[PDB]
Amino acid sequence: GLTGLEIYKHLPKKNCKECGQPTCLAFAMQIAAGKAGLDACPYVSDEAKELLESASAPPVALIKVGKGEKVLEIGHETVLFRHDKRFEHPCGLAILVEDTLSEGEIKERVEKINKLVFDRVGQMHSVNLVALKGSSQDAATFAKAVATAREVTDLPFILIGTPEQLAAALETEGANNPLLYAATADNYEQMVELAKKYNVPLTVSAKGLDALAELVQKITALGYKNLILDPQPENISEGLFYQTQIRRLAIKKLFRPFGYPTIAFALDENPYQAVMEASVYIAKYAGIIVLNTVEPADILPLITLRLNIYTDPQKPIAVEPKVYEILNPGPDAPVFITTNFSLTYFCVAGDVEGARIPAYILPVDTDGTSVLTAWAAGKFTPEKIAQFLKESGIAEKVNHRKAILPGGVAVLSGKLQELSGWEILVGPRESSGINSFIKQRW
Amino acid sequence: AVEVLKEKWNSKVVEVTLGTGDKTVTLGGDSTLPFLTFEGEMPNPPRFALEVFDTPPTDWPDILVEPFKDVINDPVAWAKKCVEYGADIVALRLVSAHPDGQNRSGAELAEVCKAVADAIDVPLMIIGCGVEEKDAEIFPVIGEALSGRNCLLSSATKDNYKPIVATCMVHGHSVVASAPLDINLSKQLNIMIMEMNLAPNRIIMDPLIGALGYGIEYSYSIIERMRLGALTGDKILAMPVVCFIGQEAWKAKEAKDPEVAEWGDYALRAIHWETVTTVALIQAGGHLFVMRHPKSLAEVKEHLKRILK
Numbered sequence: 001g002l003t004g005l006e007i008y009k010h011l012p013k014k015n016c017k018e019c020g021q022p023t024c025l026a027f028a029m030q031i032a033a034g035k036a037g038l039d040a041c042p043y044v045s046d047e048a049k050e051l052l053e054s055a056s057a058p059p060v061a062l063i064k065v066g067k068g069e070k071v072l073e074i075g076h077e078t079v080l081f082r083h084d085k086r087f088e089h090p091c092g093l094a095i096l097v098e099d100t101l102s103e104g105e106i107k108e109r110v111e112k113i114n115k116l117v118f119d120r121v122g123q124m125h126s127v128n129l130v131a132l133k134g135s136s137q138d139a140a141t142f143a144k145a146v147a148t149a150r151e152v153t154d155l156p157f158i159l160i161g162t163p164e165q166l167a168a169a170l171e172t173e174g175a176n177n178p179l180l181y182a183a184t185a186d187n188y189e190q191m192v193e194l195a196k197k198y199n200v201p202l203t204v205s206a207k208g209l210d211a212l213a214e215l216v217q218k219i220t221a222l223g224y225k226n227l228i229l230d231p232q233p234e235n236i237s238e239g240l241f242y243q244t245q246i247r248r249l250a251i252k253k254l255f256r257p258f259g260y261p262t263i264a265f266a267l268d269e270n271p272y273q274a275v276m277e278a279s280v281y282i283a284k285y286a287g288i289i290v291l292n293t294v295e296p297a298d299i300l301p302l303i304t305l306r307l308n309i310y311t312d313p314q315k316p317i318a319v320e321p322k323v324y325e326i327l328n329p330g331p332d333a334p335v336f337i338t339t340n341f342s343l344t345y346f347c348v349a350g351d352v353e354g355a356r357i358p359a360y361i362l363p364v365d366t367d368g369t370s371v372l373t374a375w376a377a378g379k380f381t382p383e384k385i386a387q388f389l390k391e392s393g394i395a396e397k398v399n400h401r402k403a404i405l406p407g408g409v410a411v412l413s414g415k416l417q418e419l420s421g422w423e424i425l426v427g428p429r430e431s432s433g434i435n436s437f438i439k440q441r442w
Numbered sequence: 443a444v445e446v447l448k449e450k451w452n453s454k455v456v457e458v459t460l461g462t463g464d465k466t467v468t469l470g471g472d473s474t475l476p477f478l479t480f481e482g483e484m485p486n487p488p489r490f491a492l493e494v495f496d497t498p499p500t501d502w503p504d505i506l507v508e509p510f511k512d513v514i515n516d517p518v519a520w521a522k523k524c525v526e527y528g529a530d531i532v533a534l535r536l537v538s539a540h541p542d543g544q545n546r547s548g549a550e551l552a553e554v555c556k557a558v559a560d561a562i563d564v565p566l567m568i569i570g571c572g573v574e575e576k577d578a579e580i581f582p583v584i585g586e587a588l589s590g591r592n593c594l595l596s597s598a599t600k601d602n603y604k605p606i607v608a609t610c611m612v613h614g615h616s617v618v619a620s621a622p623l624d625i626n627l628s629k630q631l632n633i634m635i636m637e638m639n640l641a642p643n644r645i646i647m648d649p650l651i652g653a654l655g656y657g658i659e660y661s662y663s664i665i666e667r668m669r670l671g672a673l674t675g676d677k678i679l680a681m682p683v684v685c686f687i688g689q690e691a692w693k694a695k696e697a698k699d700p701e702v703a704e705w706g707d708y709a710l711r712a713i714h715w716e717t718v719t720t721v722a723l724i725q726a727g728g729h730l731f732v733m734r735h736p737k738s739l740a741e742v743k744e745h746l747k748r749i750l751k
């Protein structure tokens with residue numbers, strides 16, 4: 001962030017006003033406050049532009065859509081590979097809703113969209129946006145469609161429609177900070193004025209890298225930096241190419257026209273094909289992915305992939321290693337030994353409660369590692385597990401002396417029984433077998 | 443105009459050939475990251491196997507067994523149907539060899555391996571029962587019995603290698619080298635193998651992956667590190683990568699548990715679990731993907747036609 005003075009030293013110094021400003025020094029001041037871009041001055045040398053533009057700054061702008069509890073933030077990514085350093089902001093997921101639908105249908109579909117939320121590893125993860133599309137090609141219909149949708153959800157919106165449709169819908173929706181779609185070569189002056197008027201983020205849309213960059217430069221020239229990029233791929237081969245280049249050029253070349261997060265559409269009517277294209281876009285660089293499906297089974301896999309890809313490997317995922325009680329167990333209920341990797345704990349807790357089995361679960365502290373990982377690492381020992389049985393207090397919670405091992409660690413049972421003084425049962429390898437084990441053997 | 447940024451990569455993934463004569467399949471050879479053919483070459487697409495157990499599976503989900511229900515007790519007929527389902531390669535897993543199972547011998551397994559090989563027009567991958575002591579005993583016998591066919595033998599590990607590698611060198615087979623999601627472990631195992639003078643183009647690295655939601659992200663990054671190692675000149679990393687997709691995907695509760703209300707339609711999510719795991723690891727730079735469901739294979743093959751376009 002350089003002051004107008006700093007950025008003026010490299011200017012043409014013509015004071016020709018062609019950038020809209022009265023003087024070079026006052027043009028620089030407009031850009032310093034983000035009121036104009038360098039592309040507004042036609043005469044600035046390419047050397048000076050590089051010096052100024054290559055000045056320190058985040059390669060990809062952080063863009064916010066929506067406000068309050070439901071705000072989406074994306075951008076501020078610095079790397080091409082998560083092992084270089086983590087991915088910072090999980091991509092938004094959006095579900096398309098068309099305004100050719102009846103008011104009733106619109107509400108019922110947005111209601112279903114509100115339900116795409118899922119427990120993964122004991123945390124809730126959900127779709128972030130509703131993309132309302134002006135397919136009716138009528139301003140009044142679109143505006144009533146958006147108002148109607150907003151009655152049934154707190155999720156931020158992407159508004160897809162002509163400048164006329166968008167202006168009508170913004171009357172009500174402009175205060176909810178929606179993303180507008182889109183400025184094109186035909187409409188951009190009108191779309192930018194509308195964006196500034198409501199202070200909302202604006203998608204820039206053009207075909208291929210060349211046309212997208214030239215369009216972004218005309219728009220930043222008018223002083224609008226709150227931006228999402230759409231290169232318009234015809235298929236997932238073009239999309240991967242475009243996404244790779246946009247991310248590479250922003251980060252590796254400091255190419256500022258590409259210095260924003262992207263939107264990507266996987267709308268395919270074949271759900272397997274839609275889910276696979278979206279998956280490619282999650283893994284490679286998409287800021288927002290728009291889909292056509294409300295089916296939980298189509299969204300669950302994408303939620304999960306997003307979660308995984310955007311996890312920071314540096315963080316252990318662990319639960320407090322204590323006795324947990326499931327469905328208010330009595331002194332007679334089974335005691336299941338497991339580890340404190342959160343994934344493992346919630347898998348087991350999920351199968352036990354799912355089978356409606358009151359029980360105790362004992363997540364031994366492995367530093368958040370899985371059963372066989374901790375075993376191979378020397379972190380799930382007979383000695384360790386024996387200590388948990390003795391000092392956790394489980395001994396006072398149950399009348400019996402029996403505890404049940406994961407089937408995959410069965411080789412531990414003998415030594416554990418000798419150290420702990422508990423009768424050790426070997427359960428199934430998979431927790432999915434617990435229900436049947438309990439029924440038959442307990 | 444925008445100047446497309448083109449990496450100049452020093453090197454390439456070696457090209458491995460499986461099978462022999464009219465049965466061959468080639469994979470690897472990549473001088474670029476997946477699909478970026480503006481900066482280098484992709485002489486081969488990703489390749490796909492479907493699994494065949496020598497004796498029928500006793501734990502499979504109904505939705506998994508159905509596509510095979512007519513052939514599932516006959517490993518020869520089953521393998522033929524895999525090929526008809528579009529598999530590049532057939533992966534025969536010998537579960538019967540298990541010491542706590544039917545515990546079949548080297549000689550016996552050797553004959554079943556020949557029968558499958560003989561009935562199909564594509565290369566054969568052979569997977570053991572997973573008990574090292576037993577697998578080290580049966581592979582030298584199977585390899586001799588199959589001598590000269592160039593099968594893919596799965597697999598060699600840091601503490602069990604020499605038997606399976608010796609059979610590969612003597613009898614003309616290619617090997618899978620398995621190490622647990624670590625670059626340096628995988629390299630150290632490739633080194634030991636090549637010290638026996640098995641050629642660098644006779645090896646395929648197995649990262650020992652997790653499926654979607656189950657450690658796919660660790661797998662993803664190891665595989666990207668493998669590709670980047672190859673491309674930047676690290677020759678020990680220069681070999682193609684196998685992922686056992688189906689093996690892992692179908693253990694997921696999301697794939698195998700037909701009633702979870704929160705998770706939506708079972709048929710869709712069961713297949714997505716395999717296809718999404720596949721595509722993720724294709725994006726990561728994997729080469730050979732060992733799958734289970736023919737429908738998963740069919741949709742992934744379609745996705746591939748689109749992304750190669």
Ligand code: B12
Nearest residue numbers: 338344347369370371372373376406427428431622652657
């Ligand atoms: C992801 C992964 C990791 C991650 C860590 C993730 C974590 N926090 O643990 C990383 C890459 C760091 C890790 C490292 C290593 N791991 Co690792 N890796 C795995 C991988 C791919 C998935 C582990 C996982 O998340 N499992 C999912 C959880 C949910 O499973 P789980 O805890 O087993 O729980 C299920 C069952 O046990 C059962 N269950 C659990 N509790 C209970 C209780 C009862 C009563 C019952 C009845 C059932 C039950 O049901 C549960 C779910 O439904 C697997 C291979 C694979 N596909 O599984 C290996 C694997 C677990 N790990 C392996 C190894 C050897 C390693 C390393 C030692 C390799 C190395 N670097 O040296 C290390 C050691 C740890 C370390 N960091 O030094 C080995 C273990 C060898 C062994 N089993 O014999 C495996 C099997 C790979 C292999 N070699 O085949 N790896």
Ligand code: SF4
Nearest residue numbers: 014016017019024041
């Ligand atoms: S257009 Fe360029 S030369 Fe003219 S006043 Fe503005 S900054 Fe100065």
